[PDB]
Point group: D2
Chain length 408, copies 4
């Protein structure tokens, strides 16, 4: 299939007019296609080159998070009207031949944070090499797995209404605690905005009101749903004429929650897709957020070891039906378990961000506690991590660990 958007990794994303990093109804289509068209799009990694394949974490700590995410699009679809559904088949996804590695990290609390930032406040990095379908890290010994390759971010352009709501409610929330490190949301920011085929005046009004791509919203966008993977079929709400489908933020793999924030195994690559329409889909099927069907080709792991958490935090304080706090406990429990086998806490945390662990909302009614589970697939280890009568052999030798960078 022909590649309709090409990416040169050594060219600055700002120099590519078919790339953009904010959501706005007025970004012009990077290309137009007919319904039924099938084609490939190439993509920068989300940072657009900021993070390197080496053994230092300073890049993770110093990255300018206002730049993310560099998306390829918007793709225009002829005849697409507001209120349609845009049916997207993800026919395949992969890494570029010249870039067979990816990265996971923990941001510093001072520059982004993450799910377990109170336990791992310093920036770190693991590097992942791709071996066909499989991946592994020089930083995490004894671990090998097939990737669940997915776009972290995909979705259609918002209408004027939608964008106004997003900015209002999100700036409103920053207003309630504007000095929290890390912040509660990210406001529009024109300084580092890439607005596609835009320069001058229209570029500068739109860049000042253009939404950050950081959070998932009603249209889809940055959902980081690992299961929205190569082979899947997704149904997107359409808000503007021609839809304006963009995609980026490709992951070779990811755990549920993407707890590390900085991936997932983040990568540059390509997406091969087919597009079509359901006329008036949104009203016909009562669509608000996207809906999709998962892939018939995914890694078949099923020998899970499953960890539990409840809505009582690390300090012993009682919350109310809080799935977020319950998941944190399940993740911490899994980390504690892994450490008994010789993994550092950073190796374990990176693992939960990268390997295809499951996070279930098992119970959300048994007041006051929600119950959340974290499913660790045991197939990914080249030794048996199941409990036995005699106790764990502390297998993991070496002195290998994830790079760590002191704060600035």
């Amino acid at each position: 299939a022909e590649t309709l958007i090409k990416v040169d990794l050594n060219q600055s994303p700002y120099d590519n007019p078919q790339v953009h990093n904010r959501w706005h109804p007025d970004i012009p289509m990077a290309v137009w296609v007919e319904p039924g068209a099938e084609f490939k799009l190439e993509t920068y990694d989300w940072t657009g080159g900021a993070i390197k394949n080496d053994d230092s974490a300073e890049d993770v700590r110093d990255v300018d998070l206002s730049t993310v995410h560099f998306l390829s699009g918007p793709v225009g679809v002829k005849g697409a009207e507001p209120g349609d559904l845009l049916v997207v088949d993800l026919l395949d996804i992969g890494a570029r031949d010249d870039s067979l590695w990816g990265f996971n990290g923990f941001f510093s609390k001072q520059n982004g944070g993450g799910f377990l930032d109170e336990h791992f406040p310093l920036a770190q990095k693991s590097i992942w090499d791709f071996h066909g379908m499989f991946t592994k890290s020089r930083h995490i010994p004894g671990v090998n797995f097939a990737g669940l390759i997915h776009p972290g971010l995909i979705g259609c352009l918002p209408d004027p209404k939608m964008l106004a709501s997003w900015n209002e409610r999100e700036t409103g929330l920053i207003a309630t605690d504007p000095d929290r490190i890390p912040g509660l949301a990210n406001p529009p920011n024109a300084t580092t905005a890439h607005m596609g085929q835009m320069q001058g005046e229209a570029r500068d009004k739109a860049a000042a009101e253009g939404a950050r791509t950081v959070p998932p919203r009603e249209h889809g966008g940055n959902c980081d749903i690992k299961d929205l993977s190569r082979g899947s079929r997704v149904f997107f709400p359409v808000y503007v004429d021609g839809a304006g489908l963009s995609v980026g933020d490709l992951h070779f793999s990811q755990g549920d929650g993407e707890i590390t924030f900085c991936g997932a195994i983040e990568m540059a690559g390509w997406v091969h897709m087919k597009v079509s329409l359901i006329k008036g889909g949104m009203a016909k099927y009562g669509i608000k957020n996207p809906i999709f069907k998962p892939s018939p080709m995914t890694p078949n792991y099923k020998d899970y070891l499953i960890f539990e958490g409840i809505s009582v935090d690390e300090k012993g304080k009682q919350h109310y039906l809080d799935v977020t706090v319950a998941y944190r406990q399940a993740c911490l429990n899994a980390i504690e378990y892994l450490k008994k086998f010789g993994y550092s806490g950073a190796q374990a945390y990176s693992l939960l961000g990268t390997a295809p662990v499951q996070g279930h909302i098992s119970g959300v009614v048994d007041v006051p506690n929600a119950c959340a589970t974290l499913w660790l697939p045991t197939e990914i280890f080249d030794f048996d991590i199941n409990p036995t009568a005699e106790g764990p052999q502390k297998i993991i030798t070496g002195g290998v660990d994830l790079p760590i960078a002191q704060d600035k």
Copy 2:
């Protein structure tokens, strides 16, 4: 294997000395077994007979929720010491031959509430019949599925310290909003307490400080994890000598979250299990909450239709990394979708509480929005519910709906 605790459904649970409905370190063992023992335990449904197989919801409206849950146990295991892990193999689980039906319901907001109680505030009920491995409801046409049969509630007796913490933090939370309908937690309550073989003054003492079985806690207890099912192996923390393992609240099936609160498909039944020990297991493996391995025998549904939600509520107000609010959105999206096929909202809500739907914590870092997904297995419908170019057809037409009871 022999049944070590027998249950007569027509006998009041209070008259059975091997049953109890509060957690307390001093409830004496209902029976003693050797490590390696295999045996069966019979169980009351969680209410102990309050809910009937008929077409009215008044029993659900009027049930005395202080009575739940009637558990079978505690089972003493010889040589079990605090800090051990109790290894339980769930070898099989089923319904009683004389009781081949179960119930799902929504509590009234005035008497219990639930996940979608703002949308369905009146008490309702669906009745499920068991056909070998399979189930269906006269109240929900076109739906048939294999059950994922599991105990909703299982775990070991707390020590004195643990119980004190539970009461302290939970009464503390009630104190912050004591008149809230429904309540934030349930305090100890001696009026409806069944304390097993406890007699005299010690009984009345213990009943006044005995914790409700309603929430999951560090020991396990009422987790309502559907995947802790027949065929699973679970590892419980031991707090007192002999462990004191109790089990109840059997489910023929359940969806992730148990959003309906009143099940799941609640039933009476039996559990066939084997028990063993890992000496000093808790410290060896860094165990706080239980861990387990899921069953090799589960329903193989994989053709999911997957719905999404973010941390923005039904009023449009913006929350911060709130998985609970995101899941509500995903569930409501699923319900809206099913309605287009002719299901009532009540049918849809009941379905999500009963069928083995998956609830994933897909993303919990993309500030401000968490992303939660609800996975509806399409194999359970006897017609195709997948989106087509044509839009849906109302294949659900006709009479039956769930019983509904007006508020007292």
Copy 3:
């Protein structure tokens, strides 16, 4: 549901009028049901009590194979006419509460033979205990698995024409080598025939022309398809009015090919089923043999170690597209591999007949060799049997083995 055919294991099968052990159009219905009826049938093990739970193989050696199989039925279905399809839902299947064990064996070559009878010519036995969904044998250490519970034999009564063809072609084949040990087929035999409710001369006429139940045929019958298991839906061709569905020969588990001949794990038990009709199904769907849909509840083993064979026998002699010889080599390769871990050959051969191993007709065109594969699920062993750089380790300490009985 109600049990329409009851079985007393201590009663001779000949004394039960609702049992039979030959196929004949004139055996009267054991019971009549309406289409849509759901009910249970109890069953003798195929031999009807000949094999015992002990540590000697003499019963296997001496069994009278003319007696097999004692089937429960024929069940009549009101309105069923020749050329219909009888739709049978297998809703559940299990062992009797008073008989929680089963048996596998190798027949002596002198009395039955088997797939590897040139390698294991003496009669042997392994006994299997049922632990809820799971099984294991005191004769084969280190192995545990969830059973794939299925009827080895199920199908409808032949019409007069069909029965005549069966006898003609099968006696014709015996004629080509009548003194062969073991025989090529089994002729009608009135001596040990149980003809249900048939009386007098009519009974006598039928027992002399009644087909042995030993081989699978166009109607179904003794297929020993492990995947025709609890949870399946099967569609049977109907030849006579009322259909006359019979069932027996229940297996707790079996490997593809049932290579040991004497099971499988043979057992007495029960089948819970629902029946219905497709009017004129046979012509509508071009049905000759039965067709079916496998169960949504089966053991999820996927970590196979897969062995190969080609159409060259143990003497090195070249055959032509012979899948039978190819599968023998694949089984023999699997046995040789297992022996390196400390299993006897008999243990391994019993294992392949009992555990849910897969046998695939991988290639049947690459003249002169067919390619057959044997898939051994590695999850059934409590130690890792995968190849490593170091080679195997004799982990099966020994002492215990299958009973063996010298020839008479």
Copy 4:
């Protein structure tokens, strides 16, 4: 990873010195690698360009089957000695970017034949297009599936002894019926032999004794095991120093048996692989034929409709434990079923050769009949093919069919 053997589809395979089409101990290594090396090999389709993407079957009719299969290799592995096992990870496999289509056909009975050549004696062809992970044919409407991408042929060079045995037993078998159309085996043939880098005199001899690659043998070779797919790990017996691993005959998909003979969906492509050794692997693990582990990434089809056959042929003749005849019956039964939905017999036959259907050796003991099953995954049709009460609707219209060529 780097491509160590490159292929120009427009260059004659005879002009590529790193390709060969006969098995012989003396073909020199096309390249040498160290143990632990990972690399790519590109491949011709098995015919090397003979079959074209068009709507006529004459190329299939006229192809010179003495030329097949053009393999890439032999790959030398430093330190590999006879009696070792060569561990091969298949890390990924795909189609070439310039060649995103493949072909299935039936050979004429006069030039190759096939499993159902008595029913389809004239040469035919279906063409398949690749859409990322998925495939479909302009010749078979209503069918879409994810490919189970595998090498049909892979293995190591035989030693002198092995080669002598192969020729002796195979020429011996041709001797028993030398004029048979099609032949029972294919003898060595120097006319169309490509012997890699072998030269002049030494080569003219090797080409006269070099075995055809057509059948699977002890070393592996052309097994056409669909499940030996991308993601798999295979363990090959080593016969000569450096091993000499070759590979070709790549399939995008195939059904069990490869009944159509001419594929499978045959294609040109590439294989990304890693190699390593088990020193003395063959004796350590009692290896005769290869063994392998299937892939964690395969198409997840589960909703099978399963067809049966027994050892009684199309003429009604009775065979003895003949799996080959039983499989033919099961395949013919499946074809008859599909025709009721509007497919031609040719469409159905091509489908069974290409789609990932399963063929099980379900029973091989119930004298006189073997029982074989054919498993059609129903997910591959864009309409429901399951039996219902009112019968099949003839969905397949149009007038498209496979090209057919009259005999030469």
